[PDB]
Design a protein around this ligand. Structure first.
Ligand SMILES: Cc1cccc(Cl)c1Nc1nc2ccc(N3CCN[C@@H](C)C3)cc2n2cncc12
Length: 271
């Protein structure tokens, strides 16, 4: 739909950037205000750094996937510099939150709580025929009420025919990404279920890196033997067995996101 007609397009005067949160090869991420009053987060694309079309394909995807457990597109400014304006998450990224004095003191109870909200997010992604493909603590954001939401939809995709096969010179974080996706580039909701498994190790160890003290060739080599990640320090056995289902060998055997959600919900009231 054209920019002079798109419900999401906002004139650039409505926006005021107050505090750079991040900078990288492709642009900055700011905290600012929409029409004076509403905290928003603003992503600006660095001109020249990659295609406006590719940068905006992210917003368009978020036009289709709206949910309370997913970070909400708030508006776009489709003239240069292009802006993606989304809903603002106060406690920032999960990987970072878990490390702060506030996060340090959270009981295992609340960690299960949190792990359940992230699965609810995914159950809706799964249900609408989308995949995430980049599911990891660094991509869960946390709200001023200590609730969580799936963020970053740069790699997310719609999937009528069950699979998305990626480019072939194409690399993904080895520790978070399922065997089949690393080996064939074939992704399914079941490869996200795998990363969810890794993500639960981040939640429980307060953000520490998966597979403590192993390189990536050690990690691939170990998985091929039939090994899985060594039990995290202070990891309830239920949690660990739950991660094991996420780490099953065949995609089809790995559990649904609705099943994970509910399992995590039982783990939580039990505490
Ligand atoms: C701007 C944008 C574009 C595309 C997709 C999303 Cl989910 C978002 N929203 C956010 N993107 C962020 C990207 C990075 C960071 N951080 C930079 C690295 N370190 C911490 C402080 C968070 C925070 C974001 N955010 C917060 N509240 C909302 C957001």
């Amino acid at each position: 739909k054209p920019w002079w007609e798109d419900e999401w397009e906002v004139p650039r005067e409505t926006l005021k950037l107050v505090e750079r949160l991040g900078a990288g090869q492709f642009g900055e991420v700011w905290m600012g205000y929409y029409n004076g009053h509403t905290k928003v987060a603003v992503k600006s694309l660095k001109q020249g750094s990659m295609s406006p079309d590719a940068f905006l394909a992210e917003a368009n995807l978020m036009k289709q996937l709206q949910h309370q457990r997913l970070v909400r597109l708030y508006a776009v400014v489709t003239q240069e510099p292009i802006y993606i304006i989304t809903e603002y998450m106060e406690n920032g990224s999960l990987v970072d939150f878990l490390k702060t004095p506030s996060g340090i003191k959270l009981t295992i109870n609340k960690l299960l709580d949190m792990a359940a909200q992230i699965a609810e997010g995914m159950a809706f992604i799964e249900e609408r025929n989308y995949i995430h493909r980049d599911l990891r603590a660094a991509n869960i954001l946390v709200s001023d009420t200590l609730s969580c939401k799936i963020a970053d939809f740069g790699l997310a995709r719609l999937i009528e025919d069950n699979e998305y096969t990626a480019r072939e010179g194409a690399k993904f974080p080895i520790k978070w990404t399922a065997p089949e996706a690393i080996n064939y580039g074939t992704f399914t909701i079941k490869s996200d279920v795998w990363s969810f498994g890794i993500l639960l190790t981040e939640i429980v160890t307060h953000g520490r890196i998966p597979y403590p003290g192993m390189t990536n060739p050690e990690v691939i080599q170990n998985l091929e033997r039939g090994y899985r990640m060594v039990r995290p320090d202070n990891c309830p056995e239920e949690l660990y067995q739950l991660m094991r289902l996420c780490w099953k060998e065949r995609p089809e055997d790995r559990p649904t996101f609705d099943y994970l959600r509910s399992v995590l919900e039982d783990f939580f009231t039990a505490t």
